[PDB]
Design a protein around this nucleic acid. Structure first.
Ligand SMILES: [Mg+2]
Ligand SMILES: [Mg+2]
Ligand SMILES: [Mg+2]
Ligand SMILES: [Mg+2]
Ligand SMILES: [Mg+2]
Ligand SMILES: [Mg+2]
Ligand SMILES: [Mg+2]
Ligand SMILES: [Mg+2]
Ligand SMILES: [Mg+2]
Ligand SMILES: [Mg+2]
Ligand SMILES: [Mg+2]
Ligand SMILES: [Mg+2]
Ligand SMILES: [Mg+2]
Ligand SMILES: [Mg+2]
Ligand SMILES: [Mg+2]
Ligand SMILES: [Mg+2]
Ligand SMILES: [Mg+2]
Lengths: 52, 159, 185, 235, 130, 15, 52
RNA sequence: AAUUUAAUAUAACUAUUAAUAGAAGGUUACUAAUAAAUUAAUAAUUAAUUUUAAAACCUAAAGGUAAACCUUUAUAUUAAUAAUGUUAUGAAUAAUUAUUAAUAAUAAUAAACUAAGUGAACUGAAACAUCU
RNA sequence: AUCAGGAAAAUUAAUGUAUACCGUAAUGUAGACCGACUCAGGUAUGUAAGUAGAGAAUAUGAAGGUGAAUUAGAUAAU
RNA sequence: UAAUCUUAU
């Protein structure tokens, strides 16, 4: 990773809202991951335990 | 970036049905400078996608992969371009080798003379093109250039 | 006798290289000076590769007592360093010989004669060194017999003219290159 | 994720081993995958390998857009226009009339105009399970000739009914791709010829560009022998 | 507690999952002694000095040459309404590398002077000679 | 498959 | 006449003035580079006049 | 039309018999792509035969090294020209770029079978030493 | 003082110099290394506030760091 | 002592 210094400044555009952009919305993949964790790591009577 | 967007949405991206990578045959009849420009445009597009793709994978942890597919497609076009560039050089080298064989060259010259030159029912234009094609004579000096001059003189004498 | 430890030896059969064929991956730097010796180079009594041992390898066998208690012993040949005169080379050649080999040399009437005997047995019981010596002697004999005439200057005369002609076209030309060009001509 | 794996090819052998799992332990591999996936995501059909995948339009017996009768199922004897195929599974997604399943869905994936979490979604179905229509259904279709399509822009085959070859089942004319993107070059510029093979003296692309085009130190490209080299080699 | 949710002694480590693992795995730039220098194929540029410095050799430095007149109208993708073109080289065993074909093309150029092909003229075309 | 279907549905809703 | 760092600075200034490279261009001409770069978001430690 | 039984798969090893022939791994990235021809068959085709592109780094043997790195400088000389700017007196001396000709290079290679060299001991002899 | 103390890699003048690669976190008398364990063991170097002193002994502790995967009570016999 | 052998340049 290479930092550079430049004679004119720059600031990034502001990241989009959850409702606006389809891709930039971390809720879904994180939820999916959580569900996977629950299901694989569920052992005995935690099968009956309701999902998060 | 692309239109100053932190991230292209699904609608902002170009759809898969509308977009196609370049065909090798299509690339084959493009000039060197044009091909070079195309390559650099491709590279620029990849960079834009790479920035975005990284953000998607590293931060949000997505598996949507449209950007990745686009990058792959661009990479395909790039290697096709690279292939056609190599292929053209090889073809040129083969032509040079063929010309170096003397009898074959002589036959080719005879064929040229018979059909289009020394005939009626433009000639100057053909000669100027032929000059550039076969010898080092535009409108600097070498054995090849001399040979071309001699050939031109011979043609003039004939006509 | 037999030449089992010699004629058993096998060497990798080199493929005959055509002028237009593709190269091998490892081509050597310096060229082959001597001819290939049919029976390679001994891979057991490597002591004997440096000299004229007369196909006499080391034996291994058993020391046996009055009790017949067997114990492994080895039986070396009677090797000896000996500078012997070559008439062909006009110098004496110093090498390790078996006393037997020295006796054979004496019988045959010279070292060159011993080397150059056309029988296969002799060839077998020459070493790689012995083979090289033979080659040296034979080549020298051939030279003595047949000097080149019984061309170089012509080449030397033509060379500068050829170089000038090349320059007139546009390219430079070296001697070595000229020599390479006009070897077969 | 916080990965960085995607910018490299690290642990390559391990990845290969994982990727190319033996086929006799494929049930083992997929059992846990099935468990992991929610009901609305998971499919009943087998995810076939890219080798055994219908890439050609001959291999697929039907194209997205054509009308097909469903059979060997719950919604059997039902006409349905096939919407889009799935590439990994080797199957079709039909319209509303085809086979479906009602499954709960989170508010991330809610359509506009929904009261309940419960939503009916179309299940995938194989080409074996459904037969063409033209009203008359077709038992089997065969391909014998080929031609350039104007709309599809491909040298597609002729779908002919099995037995009588003259009864052609025509391909469905697709929707017009109205292209307006900045990353797609237009037809005129895309194809305009700017190069011609003219010179034998001047090479077309410069000498300093060659190293990018091909590796000058290629271990594969063996040199040709000469007479001198032969002489050096041979004793 | 190292972590407050784990009050009791499970067999969990202070950091990571397993202490053990395959030690035989290639070195990186970070590992080894002060003297251990791996490098990253980045700098066969100049030459190391007798005193420990470095002197760049600019004839052996990578420039990235960009075309002076950039054709921006060429894009990374083509419009899909254009079909993918297909060349045909019948009567030429060498194909596009065939010297005879090249000679023919040169002859054509000489005669006519930069005439565009079937595919280049007509976008509806899909197959072509050149 | 489901994701693709959902995307298609969204597109339809949009247009 | 003048020290090395000062000379370098002067050269850089001259290149800027030109609208030419502000640095000595190399001879190893890469026409078709395949390298991509990922423009990162700025950290707290960087300014608006930096990019990594 | 469906079900069952037996056989066959790109998708098991082992033994036998018959027939035929004598064959890349890893590392991580600026990912290591292909293009064609002729003939037969059924324009696209599948099949056969032939040509052709690219292909990083490491795997003793270009030179090193602490495998996947470093250093050599073939996007090199050396010469011949052409264009450019400087020095000293139309000719001479050095530097940069672009053509033309000349100069070298890339060992990852099986294992079993065969032949040769050297050649044990446990063990058996109801011990052990010849013998085995 | 005897115990008698490494090796190996020039200078003026003119012309240059756009300055490569790798290391840099934290841990390191230790829960982050070697000891099968967050193991009273083993682990190289330099600073190591002042007051006291012969001192790097000993007491204190400015600053800094720390008070812990066991707690609460009871404190028989031992 | 031009049998052998050891050393140095
Ligand atoms: Mg261990
Ligand atoms: Mg370290
Ligand atoms: Mg330094
Ligand atoms: Mg190697
Ligand atoms: Mg070193
Ligand atoms: Mg044996
Ligand atoms: Mg016994
Ligand atoms: Mg006993
Ligand atoms: Mg550190
Ligand atoms: Mg620090
Ligand atoms: Mg440890
Ligand atoms: Mg212990
Ligand atoms: Mg401890
Ligand atoms: Mg103190
Ligand atoms: Mg305190
Ligand atoms: Mg601490
Ligand atoms: Mg404790």
């Amino acid at each position: 990773k290479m930092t550079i210094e430049m004679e004119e400044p720059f600031i990034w555009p502001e990241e989009p809202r959850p409702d606006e952009n389809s891709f930039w919305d971390s809720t879904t993949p994180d939820n999916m991951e959580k569900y996977r964790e629950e299901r694989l790591n569920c052992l005995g009577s935690d099968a009956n335990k309701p999902g998060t | 970036f692309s239109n100053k967007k932190f991230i292209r949405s699904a609608d902002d991206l170009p759809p898969s049905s509308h977009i196609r990578p370049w065909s090798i045959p299509e690339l084959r009849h493009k000039s060197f400078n044009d091909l070079h420009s195309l390559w650099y445009n491709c590279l620029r597009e990849q960079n834009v996608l790479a920035r975005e793709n990284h953000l998607l994978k590293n931060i949000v942890g997505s598996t949507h992969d449209e950007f990745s597919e686009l990058s792959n497609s661009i990479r395909t076009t790039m290697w096709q371009i690279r292939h056609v560039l190599n292929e053209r050089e090889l073809a040129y080298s083969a032509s040079r080798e063929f010309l170096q064989d003397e009898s074959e060259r002589k036959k080719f010259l005879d064929t040229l003379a018979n059909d289009y030159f020394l005939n009626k029912d433009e000639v100057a234009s053909m000669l100027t093109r032929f000059q550039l094609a076969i010898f080092g004579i535009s409108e600097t000096v070498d054995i090849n250039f001399i040979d071309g001059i001699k050939f031109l003189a011979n043609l003039k004498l004939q006509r | 006798r037999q030449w089992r430890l010699i004629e058993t030896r096998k060497i990798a059969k080199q493929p005959n290289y055509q002028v237009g064929d593709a190269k091998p991956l490892h081509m050597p730097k310096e060229r082959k000076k001597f001819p290939d010796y049919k029976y390679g180079e001994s891979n057991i009594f490597k002591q004997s590769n440096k000299g004229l041992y007369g196909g006499s390898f080391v034996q291994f066998g058993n020391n046996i007592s009055e009790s017949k208690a067997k114990t492994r012993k080895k039986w070396l040949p009677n090797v000896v360093k000996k500078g012997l005169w070559s008439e062909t080379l006009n110098r004496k050649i110093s090498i390790k010989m078996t006393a037997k080999v020295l006796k054979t040399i004496s019988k045959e009437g010279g070292i060159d004669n011993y080397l150059t005997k056309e029988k296969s047995a002799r060839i077998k019981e020459l070493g790689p060194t012995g083979w090289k010596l033979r080659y040296r002697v034979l080549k020298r004999k051939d030279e003595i017999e047949n000097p080149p005439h019984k061309r170089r200057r012509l080449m030397s005369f033509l060379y500068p003219l050829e170089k000038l002609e090349y320059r007139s076209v546009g390219k430079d030309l070296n001697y070595k290159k000229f020599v390479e060009l006009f070897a077969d001509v | 994720s916080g990965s960085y794996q995607h910018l490299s090819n690290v642990g390559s052998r391990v990845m290969k081993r994982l990727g190319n799992r033996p086929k006799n332990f494929l049930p083992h591999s997929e059992k846990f995958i099935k468990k992991s996936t929610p009901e609305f995501m998971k499919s009943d059909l087998k995810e076939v390998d890219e080798k055994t995948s219908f890439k050609s339009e001959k291999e697929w017996k039907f194209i997205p857009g054509d009308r097909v009768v469903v059979m060997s199922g719950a919604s059997k004897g039902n006409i349905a226009v096939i919407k889009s195929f799935d590439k990994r599974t080797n199957s079709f997604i039909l319209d509303e009339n085809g086979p479906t399943k009602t499954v709960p869905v989170p508010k991330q994936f809610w359509l506009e105009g929904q009261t309940s979490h419960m939503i009916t979604i179309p299940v995938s179905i194989l080409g074996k399970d459904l037969r063409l229509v033209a009203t008359v259904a077709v038992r089997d279709v065969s391909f014998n000739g080929s031609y350039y399509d104007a709309d599809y822009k491909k040298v597609m085959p002729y779908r002919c009914v099995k037995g009588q070859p003259d009864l052609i089942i025509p391909w469905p004319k697709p929707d017009p791709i109205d292209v307006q993107t900045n990353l797609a070059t237009d037809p005129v510029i895309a194809r305009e010829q700017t190069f011609w093979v003219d010179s034998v003296v001047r090479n077309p692309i410069p000498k300093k560009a060659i190293p990018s085009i091909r590796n000058p130190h290629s271990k594969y490209k063996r040199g040709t022998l000469t007479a001198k080299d032969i002489a050096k080699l041979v004793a | 507690l190292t972590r407050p949710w784990k009050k009791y002694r499970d067999g969990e480590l202070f950091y990571g999952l397993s202490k053990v693992g395959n030690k035989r795995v290639p070195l990186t730039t970070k590992q080894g002694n002060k003297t251990m220098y791996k490098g990253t194929r980045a700098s066969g540029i100049g030459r190391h000095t007798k005193f420990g410095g470095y002197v760049i050799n600019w004839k052996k430095v990578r420039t990235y040459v960009t075309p002076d007149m950039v054709n921006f109208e060429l894009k990374p993708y083509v419009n899909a309404n254009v079909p993918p073109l297909k060349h045909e080289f019948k009567g030429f065993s060498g194909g596009p590398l065939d010297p005879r074909l090249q000679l023919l093309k040169i002859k054509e150029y000489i005669v006519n002077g930069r005439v565009q092909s079937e595919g280049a003229t007509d976008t509806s075309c899909y197959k072509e000679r050149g | 498959d489901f994701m693709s279907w959902f995307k298609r549905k969204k597109q339809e809703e949009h247009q | 006449d003048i020290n090395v760092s000062e000379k370098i600075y002067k050269w850089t200034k001259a290149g800027i003035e030109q609208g030419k490279e502000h640095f000595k261009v190399g001879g190893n001409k890469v026409y078709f580079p395949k390298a991509r770069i990922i423009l990162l978001r700025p950290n707290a430690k960087h300014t608006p006049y930096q990019a990594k």
